[PDB]
Amino acid sequence: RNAFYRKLQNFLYNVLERPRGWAFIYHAYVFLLVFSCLVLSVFSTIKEYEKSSEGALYILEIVTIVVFGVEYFVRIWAAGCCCRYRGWRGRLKFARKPFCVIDIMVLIASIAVLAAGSQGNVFATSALRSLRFLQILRMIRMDRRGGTWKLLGSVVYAHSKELVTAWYIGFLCLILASFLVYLAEKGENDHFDTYADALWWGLITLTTIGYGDKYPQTWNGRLLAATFTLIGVSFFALPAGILGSGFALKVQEQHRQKHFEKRRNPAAGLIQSAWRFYATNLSRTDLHSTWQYYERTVGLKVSIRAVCVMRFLVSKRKFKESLRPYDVMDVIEQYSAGHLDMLSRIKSLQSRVDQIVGR
Amino acid sequence: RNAFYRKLQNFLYNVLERPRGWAFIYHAYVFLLVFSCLVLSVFSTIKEYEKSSEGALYILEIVTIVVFGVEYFVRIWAAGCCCRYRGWRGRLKFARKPFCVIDIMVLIASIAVLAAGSQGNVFATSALRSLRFLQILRMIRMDRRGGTWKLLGSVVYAHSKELVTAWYIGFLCLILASFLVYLAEKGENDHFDTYADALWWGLITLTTIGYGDKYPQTWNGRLLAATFTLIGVSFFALPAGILGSGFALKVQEQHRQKHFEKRRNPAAGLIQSAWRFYATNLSRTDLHSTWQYYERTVGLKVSIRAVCVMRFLVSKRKFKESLRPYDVMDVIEQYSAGHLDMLSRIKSLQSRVDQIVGR
Amino acid sequence: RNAFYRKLQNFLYNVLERPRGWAFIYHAYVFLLVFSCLVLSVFSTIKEYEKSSEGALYILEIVTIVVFGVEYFVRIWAAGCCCRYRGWRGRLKFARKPFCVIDIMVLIASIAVLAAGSQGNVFATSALRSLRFLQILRMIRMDRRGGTWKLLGSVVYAHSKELVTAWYIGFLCLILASFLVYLAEKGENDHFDTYADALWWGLITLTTIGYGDKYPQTWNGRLLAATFTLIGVSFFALPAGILGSGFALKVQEQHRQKHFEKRRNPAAGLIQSAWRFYATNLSRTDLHSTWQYYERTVGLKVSIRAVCVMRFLVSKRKFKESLRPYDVMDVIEQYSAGHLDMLSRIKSLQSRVDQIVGR
Amino acid sequence: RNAFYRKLQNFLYNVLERPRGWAFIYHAYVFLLVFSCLVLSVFSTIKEYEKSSEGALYILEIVTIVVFGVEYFVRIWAAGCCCRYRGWRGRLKFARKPFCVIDIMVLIASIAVLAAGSQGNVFATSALRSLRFLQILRMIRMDRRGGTWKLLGSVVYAHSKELVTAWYIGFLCLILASFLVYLAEKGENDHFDTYADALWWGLITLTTIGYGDKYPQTWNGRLLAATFTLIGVSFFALPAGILGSGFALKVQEQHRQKHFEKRRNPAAGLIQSAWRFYATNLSRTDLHSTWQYYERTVGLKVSIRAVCVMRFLVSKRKFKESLRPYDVMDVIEQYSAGHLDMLSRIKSLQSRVDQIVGR
Amino acid sequence: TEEQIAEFKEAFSLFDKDGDGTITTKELGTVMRSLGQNPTEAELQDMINEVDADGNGTIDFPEFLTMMARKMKDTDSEEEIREAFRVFDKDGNGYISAAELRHVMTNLGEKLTDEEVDEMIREADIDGDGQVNYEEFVQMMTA
Amino acid sequence: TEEQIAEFKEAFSLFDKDGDGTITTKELGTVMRSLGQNPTEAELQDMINEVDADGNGTIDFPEFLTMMARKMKDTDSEEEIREAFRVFDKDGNGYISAAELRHVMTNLGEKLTDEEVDEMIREADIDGDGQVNYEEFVQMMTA
Amino acid sequence: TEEQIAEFKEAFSLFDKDGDGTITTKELGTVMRSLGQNPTEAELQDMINEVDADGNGTIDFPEFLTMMARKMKDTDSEEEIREAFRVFDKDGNGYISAAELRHVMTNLGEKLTDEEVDEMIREADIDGDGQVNYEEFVQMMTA
Amino acid sequence: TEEQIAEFKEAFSLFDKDGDGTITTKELGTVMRSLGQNPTEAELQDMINEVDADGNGTIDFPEFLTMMARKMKDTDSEEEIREAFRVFDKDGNGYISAAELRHVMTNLGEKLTDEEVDEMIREADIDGDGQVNYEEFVQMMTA
Numbered sequence A, B, C, D: 001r002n003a004f005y006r007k008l009q010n011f012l013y014n015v016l017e018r019p020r021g022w023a024f025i026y027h028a029y030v031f032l033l034v035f036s037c038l039v040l041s042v043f044s045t046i047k048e049y050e051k052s053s054e055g056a057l058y059i060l061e062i063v064t065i066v067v068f069g070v071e072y073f074v075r076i077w078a079a080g081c082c083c084r085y086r087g088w089r090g091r092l093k094f095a096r097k098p099f100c101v102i103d104i105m106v107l108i109a110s111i112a113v114l115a116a117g118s119q120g121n122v123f124a125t126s127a128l129r130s131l132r133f134l135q136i137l138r139m140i141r142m143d144r145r146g147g148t149w150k151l152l153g154s155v156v157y158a159h160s161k162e163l164v165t166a167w168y169i170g171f172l173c174l175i176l177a178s179f180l181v182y183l184a185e186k187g188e189n190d191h192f193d194t195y196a197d198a199l200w201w202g203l204i205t206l207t208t209i210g211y212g213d214k215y216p217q218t219w220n221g222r223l224l225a226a227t228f229t230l231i232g233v234s235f236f237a238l239p240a241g242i243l244g245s246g247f248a249l250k251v252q253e254q255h256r257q258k259h260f261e262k263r264r265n266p267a268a269g270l271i272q273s274a275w276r277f278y279a280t281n282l283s284r285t286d287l288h289s290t291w292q293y294y295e296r297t298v299g300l301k302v303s304i305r306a307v308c309v310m311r312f313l314v315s316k317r318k319f320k321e322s323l324r325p326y327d328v329m330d331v332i333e334q335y336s337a338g339h340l341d342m343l344s345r346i347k348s349l350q351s352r353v354d355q356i357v358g359r
Numbered sequence E, F, G, H: 001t002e003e004q005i006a007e008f009k010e011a012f013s014l015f016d017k018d019g020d021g022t023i024t025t026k027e028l029g030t031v032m033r034s035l036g037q038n039p040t041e042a043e044l045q046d047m048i049n050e051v052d053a054d055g056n057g058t059i060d061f062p063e064f065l066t067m068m069a070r071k072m073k074d075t076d077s078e079e080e081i082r083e084a085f086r087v088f089d090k091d092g093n094g095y096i097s098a099a100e101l102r103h104v105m106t107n108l109g110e111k112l113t114d115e116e117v118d119e120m121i122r123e124a125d126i127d128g129d130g131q132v133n134y135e136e137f138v139q140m141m142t143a
């Protein structure tokens, strides 16, 4: 069943590499399993629940090594589906991907720690640390693309000036308020023994964590703390609000722009122009016969080649400016072109009717 | 008074099912009553205020069973107003609605617990649990449509990628900061006895709850806690800001789009086309006489039917693309069509004036 | 100096009633003074700082009664400037304004409490409560228009559905998490003695206040608290973010719309139409001579009156739809009208050129 | 190497004064160094880590004085590159800049405190305070332009009304809730001894700091605290959300507007008009020969001068309205002009075709 | 009075061209084109909407008479005119310089002649100072 | 039945002008211009799209017949017609006054004559009260 | 000087066509059409606005003379010209290559001839290096 | 080779009309109008921009020859063609059905004939299955 085999392999590749829709379910399950393991590892640290947590953790470690090995082999097969990695050499080339090699390294580490535990020589602390680190490593691997980091960095850089303003003003407010409260309390309050303690109090207050170990206990200390916290809490909360609003606005703008679509025209122009520019052959029976057709519509050889490259070049630029269309640029440029065109045609109407009057 | 009876029944149905405006007041009152009951139930748990709270709770339980029964009967009558549930069978069909059956089940449970309390055999704990659960059930019933859940899910899915980025980065920051502070403190601080305690501290800090039971007490622990919290608090606060900004932007976009309106044209076209397509009868005295009129304006039978269905089909599509008009799609498509039309007519002007010059 | 007196009176009226710009400075000072008094009143409650705070409070009370009396008299004079309150009867009419009568009542109460303190019979508690309440009353009076309340209510109603979703989901999460943690801890933890205590803990946690008196101390309690808080904190923080984003979007939309301006055309039309409709007199030497002029441009009397009222009526509607212009409505309607007009004129071009060909 | 020297001097000036891109790296490093020093200063306050922190602080102080001196001299050289400060007098004029004089004062203070420490007479407290204040002074100097303060003030003023609404409503809620909880608890709870304590509790609660020293312990106190905090926390969190959303919206609007660009046309017109208006000379061999050319295209002298100034004036205005183009103003005005122009030309078409019919 | 009804009928017939008992958009357009000002079809349709209550697309005699019986005092017209004046009130106190009206009121929208604006001044400006107070003037018109 | 197929072929030939076995946009345009209503090329292209499944740019006999075999009951047309009626349902209960249809249904979009709207009324309004209930009417049409 | 006033009056009469003592939009339009460049009515209205202070819709002799008495030094023109130069300053230091002006200054807006731009260069570029420094040049023009 | 340079000069003269040693926008427009396709001035200006490096507004012989010496392999053209193919890759694996190209590649933009698209198929589709793999094809063209 060649068709069935290809269809199944493509389906598995889509699920394991490009989970557009319901495929995410599977990934979630895997994450859950991994996450569950992590939680068990935490329970393994506690000495009270050592036995049951250790047993469940070993069972889940066996299950997860099995699942990860099966997934890795199936992912090798799926990458085999992709033309970029067709054949044994292509699959090996795919397996050199940094995330794939990281995953296989984690798998080998897990099987190795299990085997060492079977041996018994390996200390329990070593195995626990190893398994915890492998679990977090697969957690990181879940991204597999760096999409979250890239998005966060993009939004942070977009609001770099505003974030820096928030950080700078909040830092100045923290320093000033901590110093003033330190002066107010100093010896009166045991909490504010040293300026380092005052800075710790200020950081824990303006962030609104408010542990309660440190807090002013004098009338002037409390007065200054009130006046300064009323603004410092907002300053320290600013970055979260700025980033959240930026994320929401970016989501809105994307849901508009990527929902525009209506593209691939410059890409089609590129395909045509590359085809014609490759066709500029040495008078062989290939498309250069179509080039003789093209020149028929009209030494001359060079001009033909020239024009082909020209379309190629121009097409390139179009796609380059059409890769990420901007609504404001599109609308402004189209309005300018259209209105200028209509005005020019109207003036042509005036000239033509004037000559008609002359006629 | 047929007119008066119909008007009153419609008014009650609107109040109890489609509370557009002032009708909400009534619902609020009901909620308040239910909410009040809930609060009393809480006071019933405390052993100090058992007597007074129990007496007031019994009085309010009688009042609320009475009110809910009256409301249920009046709601059955109101649904009777609706044509979909006209007649005894229609009203019974209405009563099968999941929320209606849930409400009647809650009513029976409340009357049953009251009767059991009258009997005295039922234990007080059973009655208290029953009444608390029925109260929360009616609280959930207040929605009656799942609107809140649907809206929250829609906004969450819209920002699924941003929310996942926030969760992932915050989780990584929590794990890293908790582990580093655990290493810094470990044995020096009694609070951070085990890594589970460190994780609890990290969760309570980055969320800014800051209970105060756990907090670093070492110079390196406090330094790392400061550096990591300064960013972790923002990361954990991100989701609230993202969701709030998304909600506000959605409200703005809705207050624009639903404020557009200017629709029902495709719906009217659909009505006309369905009427004409039904009219394609077997040469009877019905609209098919109007079909003879339509064909008069021009074997042929099929074409008539064809064209009728055709309008139907196109009408359908129009309404489908006019159900939820998008400002950007509307504006872009209308601009393209209008400018292209004007340009084509201008070129027609050029051709016609050229031939006039020829004439 | 009639001109100087009128100019000064207008300047004081603008400062005291319509503080557009730098005038706000003065108001701020007054607020500061009032606020200072309030703070002193707080220090008066403390028994340790009774003497100095009482002395400063009495001095500031004398100062503030003097300032408020001077301001009230000058405000009477300023309202006298306004034509609406010209003359003694006009000033008395202005003085019936609820905020003015509230201010004079507060002034009388302050002078009365000062006189009673001079007498000595009045108990200190009575005077302290009186002065605190008068201070808060003037603080409320600072608004003088209800602008803050109106703006907050407008933004809240705009996002009524989203806010209700946030409240409902957060309430359900609070109830569920509190009950689950109560079950987990119950007797193990002294904090969660009763479900009321669990509800208090849940409210103080999800709001992120985190006092620290209540907190889970069991493995299952802490696990459930983590899972539920991770979402409850965001749900409870939602309303602040929603309102803030709504306020920012409203500010943006206002800074666009009110910055449009370009109006008063329908208002001018209203002025003209009202002038002409009043002019429809009983054939007297007033504008009805201009009505004879108007009818000259053409029993007939009624038509004249008709048309005048007609302009009036239409003018009204225009101003009514031009009071709060909407950018989207303006742009969409102007685009529709303009493109339809151009298309119709283009078809007129086609018809005229066709007949020219015929000619 | 004149070219090499000029290029290097310009590169250093750009890095030290206009760090557009990668140059920021250097600044960051400097900040880090300064920041590191600050942290060491904090460790110097603690008596336990006095020795090591003092040694590292002295080493870093020597390093930072060296770096700041080198940077100041190189910045003098760089400002020398700028034409505004060419020559010795120009460099001296640049050195009078307030930030430059502040920096040199800080440098002198640092070298002076180091020399005094070498002498040993200066008390350790004096040196520590001096170095801490100099460190914060350079931290402030990092801005060098007041950009953060200006941006924050702009956004705050933009949302002045909304922020004032938030502050006012939150203040009223704080006062009311604190007073009600004070009445509820008063003598029952030791925490709420006096109304000042109640106000402190209310401030620490509504801000969500929640130290835990103060918290209600009575049924009515807790009930009122719940009802009032549920709204007060949101009111106090509002300003952060409002400012964050405003910052994000401002970033979006800027990333649109400043990304428009397509300007310098009015600036070019201004340059031309200034050139021509200067050219209106006393009939000398300068551009006034070009003025004879200009008048050739046509006592008359004045008109020439008139028209030149006129372009100047009009050019000025254009640039003034083109300095900060607004998308809404640009689009609305261009639409009005274009549509009115097309309509007028269409009516010209109607008139011309009518006369052609007459012809 | 019967004389008013006779005037109403006479002018309604005058506006009527075909004689259908109702005034159409074209009738108003042509009669006010004879009046010198050429309208737009939107304005005529607006009149048709404002007079007619049954949506007949024209102006019938009953609605004509009912609109005739409605004088300014019975129009609830105070708020609209007050707001229109206020939008033109730069100072906001309520006084407007007659020169301001002459510059603007006769330069915007339905521009009026010098006689009409000066009559406005002498009507509203009872004091004859130039500081016209719109509130009292409009209130006494609506009396 | 064979008679239906003969009718189909006869009218398909009638629409056909050049005789290529398919109906193009121009054929539909001209035939329905003879019908009195002049379309727009967008409408004809929409018909070409909705009939044709192979994207030939015209209407062929097989797709014509397949569309013919699809009656209203086999169209999944209940939701669209119900929604269209609902958008016109001001009260939202499901009853619409026949006068409302006469005022609107014959005044918007493809306006219909008095006979057609009255036939709609007597069809849907079985009770003959004027409170037409669209749900039952559309359901029984789709039967 | 009286000679300057005589020149002013002579040219004001020259611009004047009907002889009303004021220069209208059409007068400026026709005189500068004779000058070769055809304006737009917006530009002529802009001149009417910027000269006239009483809003007469034209240019009168007193405002003409007052604008004449205002030389560059008494115009507060430093900021505008500095900003205009800065917007064209790519490097931002204050030096612009004369080749840059030749490429741009004569290719945008009111494009000037080679003679005018070269005279600009030899005027501002005292050093004769091509790195024109706009600040000193504009300051000395405004002197 | 000298033959290539002779060809270059011969065709450059052919395009040249006035004989100024450079090819202007009008020359390209007229020569490719003879070619059957009528351009827009924007396209000719785009060509002028892409060839010319000194901004002369035309195409000179040196830039012509330099552009001639640049073959596909020395164009850094892999990314653009790969991205263009990817945007058309619905599945995203890298395989496209030749029928998909025939339906789309010859129906959008610069539509090509059946011969050209079939030659594309037989060129890229070495396996002759219809699942053209654009990556290898474009890479080997760029070889």
Ligand SMILES: C#CCn1nc(NC(=O)C(CCC)CCC)c2cccc(OC(F)F)c21
Residues within 6 Å of the ligand: C156, C163, C166, C167, C168, C169, C170, C171, C172, C174, C235, C236, C237, C238, C239, C240, C243, D230, D231, D234, D235
């Ligand atoms: C979610 C959540 C927490 N939250 N937040 C609230 N805040 C507001 O409503 C407005 C007050 C004005 C109506 C805040 C804006 C000023 C609120 C009110 C009632 C109950 C709540 O919890 C319950 F629903 F779980 C509330």
